[PDB]
Design a protein around this nucleic acid. Structure first.
Ligand SMILES: [K+]
Ligand SMILES: [K+]
Ligand SMILES: [K+]
Ligand SMILES: [K+]
Ligand SMILES: [K+]
Ligand SMILES: [K+]
Ligand SMILES: [K+]
Ligand SMILES: [K+]
Ligand SMILES: [Mg+2]
Ligand SMILES: [Mg+2]
Ligand SMILES: [Mg+2]
Ligand SMILES: [Mg+2]
Ligand SMILES: [Mg+2]
Ligand SMILES: [Mg+2]
Ligand SMILES: [Mg+2]
Ligand SMILES: [Mg+2]
Ligand SMILES: [Mg+2]
Ligand SMILES: [Mg+2]
Ligand SMILES: [Mg+2]
Ligand SMILES: [Mg+2]
Ligand SMILES: [Mg+2]
Ligand SMILES: [Mg+2]
Ligand SMILES: [Mg+2]
Ligand SMILES: [Mg+2]
Ligand SMILES: [Mg+2]
Ligand SMILES: [Mg+2]
Ligand SMILES: [Mg+2]
Ligand SMILES: [Mg+2]
Ligand SMILES: [Mg+2]
Ligand SMILES: [Mg+2]
Ligand SMILES: [Mg+2]
Ligand SMILES: [Mg+2]
Ligand SMILES: [Mg+2]
Ligand SMILES: [Mg+2]
Ligand SMILES: [Mg+2]
Ligand SMILES: [Mg+2]
Ligand SMILES: [Mg+2]
Ligand SMILES: [Mg+2]
Ligand SMILES: [Mg+2]
Lengths: 50, 187, 135, 141, 127, 125
RNA sequence: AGGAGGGCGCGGCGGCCGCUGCAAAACCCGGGGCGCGAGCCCGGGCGGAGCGGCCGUCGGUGCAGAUCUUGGUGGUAGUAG
RNA sequence: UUGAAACACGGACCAAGGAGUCUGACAUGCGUGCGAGUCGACGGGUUCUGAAACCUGGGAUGCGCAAGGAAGCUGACGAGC
RNA sequence: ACAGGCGAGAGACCGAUAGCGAACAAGUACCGCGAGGGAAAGAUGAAAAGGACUUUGAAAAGAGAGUCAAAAGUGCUUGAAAUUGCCGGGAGGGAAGCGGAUGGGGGCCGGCGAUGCGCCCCGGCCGUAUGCGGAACGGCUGGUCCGCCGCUCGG
């Protein structure tokens, strides 16, 4: 038969983010890379990093 | 069996925590949970409650309101708002005021600092005024919203000035037969 | 970045945190990191969210404490000592570097407890278990 | 997002939240704005007074750009004057057309300092307020 | 990481191209490594298997056994080596098929195009 | 080691809530399903019918999830996960995961004997 | 009837942590337990190559019914004939 | 359905499949950013993993910042209890 | 602009009742006077090494045997349920099944349940102080460790 609600190609695939909010997210993700505790929490092995 | 409503349990709901997930706000809540437990201050109790409030329950406050609410009492008095301070171009004189807020716009921060004031966070107000002494608690206009204009009695009842929900504005959008006597009636 | 800020970032998910049995009352959580004396996911015990931490691991027992002014430099963050003396002499050093120094006095009982378990674990390592402890 | 929909919470419940008596049917009441004068009259009268009927005269080929008149109030004029120009000031002269404005309206308070305003249009109160501050108006096109 | 726009990384497409290959392409696909002595002498690494090449088996249960290629069954992707056989239930003898990627060529049959091929492949592997 | 739990473990019901009419039909499974029919005897709680689970059956918070050997279970997959119970060996027992091989089971059972950690299924495989 | 909250389970994607030819998935079992429950964990067997858990996010995501669809199988019955 | 064990309908059994979804327009609520501004959505530049990403075009593109009137046309002179 | 044609690339798509009707001699077999309608059907094994030979039987087949890591034995990977046969167990006066509670019988289990802990004759290590090496805490004093000595004696 036919699927209940056949998947159409005009689904919303791409999502808009405000440019300002994207820049805030990058700046927040950039600063997290400098505190070593959050880097270890992500699983990186940095015990011998000067 | 005992005659009670809902078993006597409280059916009113209220916020006991912020719905948001901001870690800096969660740290402010922990700090002010401590202050209201071990200082017993009425001021600190209000701050903790408003720290839970949603965005529409914390309206923005402009400079015009702040410079008029804090008119002569801007020395030895810190203005406190749980919300945002926005800028105002319609005023020219800005006195030196100490203001603590959740957020400042970059134009409001520049306006305060250039006038000689200070912009404080709520973790800085706790050090200066642990029990909220010599402070002015302020709120923005709660009902100055376009959504509130559609609230209340229906637009089609007598003595009602509620905004209708119309897709456009003009002579052909809801102005006849209910809006004037020449077409039927005028409610 | 203070420890209170770090704790809220790593509390939910973590490369060292192990969670089991979902998010019901059945949930069981542990931490895998060194310098976490009881392997428990809590702010007091976390080896990631605290500036001062003690590690009691075998090798001979290695005691490790972290330097507060060397947070930005991981290669010199751990001041490590290796002790091969009798238990009481090792227990005295742990109390000295943790309690009497005021370097986390709240961890002096977890640290002495863990040193007991590590030393006991090494005791049977050289000479196999000849008795089981069910009494 | 499907994981948060309330239909997922209604799995196992027979009617999916639509009732056993007044079920979910196709179009009880009609389609769209049907019956807005017959069985939806109370709804149309209560929430949309004015909906039916015809008022006013038609305008064939009404071009929007003919009625383009952006406006600015006096209370905002001094924000267009830069800091160093106010320090130098004689009165600064502002052509509000260079900021996208046609008519000057008179809501709000002007500072008690002279200012010259160039505009295509202006209201009577805005002109009275500008003159009371010691300023002047120049009509341009 | 591949960069060519004209080269497909699709697993479906690569398997279809491998298995639906013409005879002349299976010759290149059915190549064998050279022995250490032959690689040193010719400065080439691998060569397409040929009939009457001398081969040694280096993988499987016949690892170590030697012989000469009696058959190149390109349709089945296997080569048959002399005296690498098995008895059936009725006692008859059947040649065992081995993939040419699990053998090394020890002696090469060279007519005139084997030498020319060896010259072409050496120059790239020599420079 | 020696279990630290001392309060007696009481169960309000050592019996499963089997789905109503799962005895009558082969295709109905025993996993509990809340009846929702309008005329349902089981939903309406007539006496003599199938019982329905509710929050009043819940077990004491101090003894819930404790195994009969008075320990609480933690499933391990290798030696490093077993090291995490060394400071909790009086309250937690270790169970080796079902798909861990016999070679690694030997290593976990040896390390747990050194650490005095109890393994519930150490004789398996 | 209805609303809401918190949880359980299925399949992907981005991450993290693992398992497995010293036997993965699936399936079977008067095996043992945990949870009020959805479910989960272990044991024994079969099988012979892959699989899991946690955080985030997404979805063709949970069946007893619909004279429901397709397939398979009963009693009727060694009967009518 | 007022009322079902009903002499009211559907259901012999089992397995697999099987029903509030996607899109548009509004609305309330909530969350995030900025804030008298906000949006970079179509284009352009660039991008050596990339139909990502990153940068850039608004002194007027859209919603806001001002109404009322059919229209011609006018347009908030700054509160007390 | 481009659901056609020829040729390429990719995917948070489907995975044999799904995805095109068609993964396969699929617009095929087959149905209709005709216009038209329209399926089901993928998987041994690494390699056929696809089961020689003896014996019973009219044969089909069986019983031995052989190949294989395995019979995985040519619709052959795995192989659920309904339903059926046999073996063993239990019950039964016009249904049975079901809830609660015990008992009788069975099947399981040993983290199902302990054998250690303080005092004493045998085995076996060192303070205090030192020289030296590294690296700490607090904000200039004091701290720990290790290897070596030379006095020391309690463990
Ligand atoms: K509803
Ligand atoms: K998921
Ligand atoms: K019936
Ligand atoms: K704009
Ligand atoms: K008029
Ligand atoms: K088909
Ligand atoms: K098999
Ligand atoms: K029987
Ligand atoms: Mg009561
Ligand atoms: Mg009630
Ligand atoms: Mg009237
Ligand atoms: Mg209904
Ligand atoms: Mg209805
Ligand atoms: Mg009705
Ligand atoms: Mg139970
Ligand atoms: Mg198992
Ligand atoms: Mg059974
Ligand atoms: Mg899974
Ligand atoms: Mg899908
Ligand atoms: Mg579905
Ligand atoms: Mg079904
Ligand atoms: Mg149902
Ligand atoms: Mg039927
Ligand atoms: Mg059927
Ligand atoms: Mg029949
Ligand atoms: Mg007969
Ligand atoms: Mg009736
Ligand atoms: Mg009924
Ligand atoms: Mg009746
Ligand atoms: Mg009917
Ligand atoms: Mg019937
Ligand atoms: Mg289904
Ligand atoms: Mg084309
Ligand atoms: Mg098909
Ligand atoms: Mg399937
Ligand atoms: Mg015919
Ligand atoms: Mg295989
Ligand atoms: Mg089979
Ligand atoms: Mg069966």
């Amino acid at each position: 038969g036919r699927m209940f609600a056949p998947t159409k190609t005009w689904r919303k695939w791409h999502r808009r983010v405000n440019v300002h909010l994207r820049r805030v997210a990058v700046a927040s993700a950039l600063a997290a890379t400098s505190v070593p505790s959050l880097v270890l929490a992500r699983g990186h092995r940095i015990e011998t990093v000067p | 069996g005992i005659d009670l409503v809902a078993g006597g349990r409280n059916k009113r709901t209220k916020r006991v925590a912020p719905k948001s997930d901001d870690v800096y706000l969660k740290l402010l809540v922990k700090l002010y949970r401590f202050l209201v437990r071990r200082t017993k201050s009425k001021f600190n109790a209000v701050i903790l409650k408003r720290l839970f409030m949603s965005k529409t329950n914390r309206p923005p406050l402009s400079m015009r309101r702040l410079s008029n609410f804090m008119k002569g009492k801007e020395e030895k008095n810190i203005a406190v708002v749980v919300g945002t301070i926005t800028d105002d171009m319609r005023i020219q004189e800005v006195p030196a005021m100490k203001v603590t807020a959740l957020r400042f716009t970059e134009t409001a921060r520049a306006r305060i600092i250039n006038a000689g004031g200070e912009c404080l966070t709520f973790d800085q107000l706790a050090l200066r005024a642990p029990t909220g002494e010599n402070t002015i608690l302020l709120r923005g206009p709660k009902n100055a919203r376009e959504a509130v204009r559609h609230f209340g009695k229906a637009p089609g009842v007598p003595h009602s000035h509620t905004k209708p929900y119309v897709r456009s504005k003009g002579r052909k959008f809801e102005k006849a037969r209910g809006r004037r006597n020449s077409r039927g009636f005028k409610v | 970045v203070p420890g209170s800020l770090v704790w809220e970032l790593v509390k939910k998910n973590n490369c060292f945190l192990i969670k089991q049995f979902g998010n019901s009352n059945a949930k069981v959580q542990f931490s895998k990191e060194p310098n976490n004396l009881y392997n428990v996911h809590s702010y007091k015990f976390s080896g990631l969210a605290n500036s001062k931490t003690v590690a009691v691991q075998p090798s001979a027992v290695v005691l490790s404490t972290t330097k507060t002014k060397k947070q930005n430099t991981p290669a010199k963050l751990q001041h490590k000592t290796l002790m091969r003396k009798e238990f009481r002499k090792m227990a005295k050093s742990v109390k000295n570097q943790v309690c009497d120094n005021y370097y986390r006095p709240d961890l002096t009982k977890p640290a002495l407890a863990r040193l007991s378990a590590v030393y006991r674990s090494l005791q049977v390592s050289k000479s196999g278990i000849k008795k089981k402890n069910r009494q | 997002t499907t994981r948060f929909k309330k239909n997922r919470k209604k799995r196992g419940h027979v009617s999916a939240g639509h009732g056993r008596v007044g079920k979910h049917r196709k179009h009880p009441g009609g389609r769209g704005n049907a019956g807005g004068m017959h069985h939806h009259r109370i709804l149309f009268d209560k929430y949309h007074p004015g909906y039916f009927g015809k008022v006013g005269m038609r305008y064939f080929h009404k071009l929007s750009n003919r009625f383009y008149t952006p406006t600015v109030n006096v209370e905002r004029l001094w924000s267009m004057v830069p800091s160093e120009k106010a320090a130098e000031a004689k009165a600064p002269v502002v052509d509000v057309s260079q900021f996208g404005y046609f008519k000057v309206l008179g809501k709000g308070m002007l500072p008690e300092k002279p200012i010259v305003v160039k505009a295509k249009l202006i209201s009577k109160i805005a002109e009275k307020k500008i003159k009371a501050a010691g300023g002047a108006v120049v009509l341009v096109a | 990481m591949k960069r060519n726009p004209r080269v497909t990384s699709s697993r479906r497409k690569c398997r279809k191209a491998h298995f639906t290959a013409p005879s002349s392409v299976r010759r290149v696909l059915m190549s064998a490594a050279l022995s250490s002595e032959l690689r040193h002498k010719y400065n080439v690494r691998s060569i397409p298997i040929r009939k009457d090449d001398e081969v040694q088996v280096v993988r499987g249960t016949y690892k170590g056994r030697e012989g000469k290629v009696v058959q190149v069954y390109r349709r089945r992707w296997v080569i048959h080596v002399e005296r690498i056989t098995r008895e059936k239930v009725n006692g008859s003898t059947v040649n065992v098929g081995i993939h040419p990627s699990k053998v090394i060529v020890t002696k090469l049959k060279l007519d005139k195009d084997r030498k020319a091929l060896l010259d072409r492949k050496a120059r790239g592997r020599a420079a | 080691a020696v279990p630290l739990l001392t309060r007696k473990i009481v169960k309000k019901r050592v019996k499963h809530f089997k789905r109503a009419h799962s005895d009558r039909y082969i295709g109905l499974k025993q996993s509990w399903r809340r009846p929702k029919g309008i005329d349902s005897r089981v939903r309406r709680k007539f006496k003599g019918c199938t019982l329905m689970p509710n929050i009043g059956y819940g077990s004491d918070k101090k003894t819930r999830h404790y195994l009969p050997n008075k320990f609480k279970k933690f499933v391990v997959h290798n030696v490093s996960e077993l090291e995490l119970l060394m400071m909790h060996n009086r309250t937690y027992c270790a169970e080796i995961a079902h798909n861990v091989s016999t070679k690694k089971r030997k290593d976990i059972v040896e390390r747990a004997a050194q650490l005095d950690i109890v393994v519930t299924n150490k004789l398996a495989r």
